[PDB]
């Protein structure tokens, strides 16, 4: 169900 | 090539505050956050704090929230990291780091050179 | 929050050794554990990530694993540059935690 990258906190 | 700048050493009085940076470049500055660690010689590495540069979303650690405040220009990809009423205990250097999300959570992939602070008189 | 634990704050290998740094968490993190290096000019790097086992553009010789609350870093075959600090950190929960880091010395 999730993503996995290319993201942030 | 994703890199962090990170402010210059700093000297200062306690009873005082300082504003320390974290440029950013080689990436979207907005599509990622920002947390910051401080490191004493007394090993391990605290998270203080994390920052989104979209929204301005800050969340903080509880033990430096209310002297800390994580700032950011986005127009210069530049966060920054304000401590207030200092004392020894804010001696160390920081960090900024920049997050990345994959399956689930959040991870550090790049790291600045830290930023070395010395609060004395 | 959570506690992160690594048992021994220095260990010792010889070039050529499959080193193996541990990490215990204070409950199950559910896979969310990363393994950052420092080297002595304090500079600090990603190795891997997600309950360990995610590379980013570091040597296949560095290994990660674990499951609920215990982790660990491998190194296969330890090199010269491999000689630093290590500390895992959670990503489960808020505020997130490292532990206090594990340094490599030679073995003489």
């Known amino acids: 169900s999730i993503p996995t990258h290319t993201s942030p906190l | 090539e994703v890199q962090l700048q990170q402010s210059g050493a700093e000297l200062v009085r306690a009873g005082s505050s300082v504003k320390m940076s974290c440029k950013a470049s080689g990436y979207t500055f907005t599509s990622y956050g920002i947390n910051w660690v401080k490191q004493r010689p007394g090993q391990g590495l605290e998270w203080i704090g994390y920052?989104?540069?979209?929204?301005?979303?800050?969340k903080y650690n509880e033990k430096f929230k209310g002297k800390t405040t994580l700032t950011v220009d986005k127009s210069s990809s530049t966060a920054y990291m304000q401590l207030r009423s200092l004392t020894s205990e804010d001696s160390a250097v920081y960090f900024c780091?920049?997050?990345?999300?994959?399956?689930?959570?959040?991870?550090?992939?790049?790291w600045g050179q830290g930023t070395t602070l010395t609060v004395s008189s | 929050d959570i506690q992160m634990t690594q048992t021994t704050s220095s260990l010792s290998a010889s070039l050529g050794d499959r080193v193996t740094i541990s990490c215990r968490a204070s409950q199950d993190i559910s896979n969310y554990l990363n393994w950052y290096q420092q080297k002595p000019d304090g500079t600090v790097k990603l190795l891997i990530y997600?309950?360990?086992r995610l590379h980013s553009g570091v040597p296949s010789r560095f290994s990660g694993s674990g499951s609920g609350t215990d982790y660990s870093l491998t190194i296969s075959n330890l090199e010269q540059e491999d000689i630093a600090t290590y500390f895992c950190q959670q990503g489960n929960t808020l505020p997130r935690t490292f532990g206090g880091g594990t340094k490599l010395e030679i073995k003489r």
């Open positions: 780091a920049r997050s990345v999300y994959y399956g689930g959570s959040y991870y550090f992939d790049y």
């Open positions: 920052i989104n540069p979209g929204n301005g979303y800050t």
């Open positions: 997600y309950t360990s």
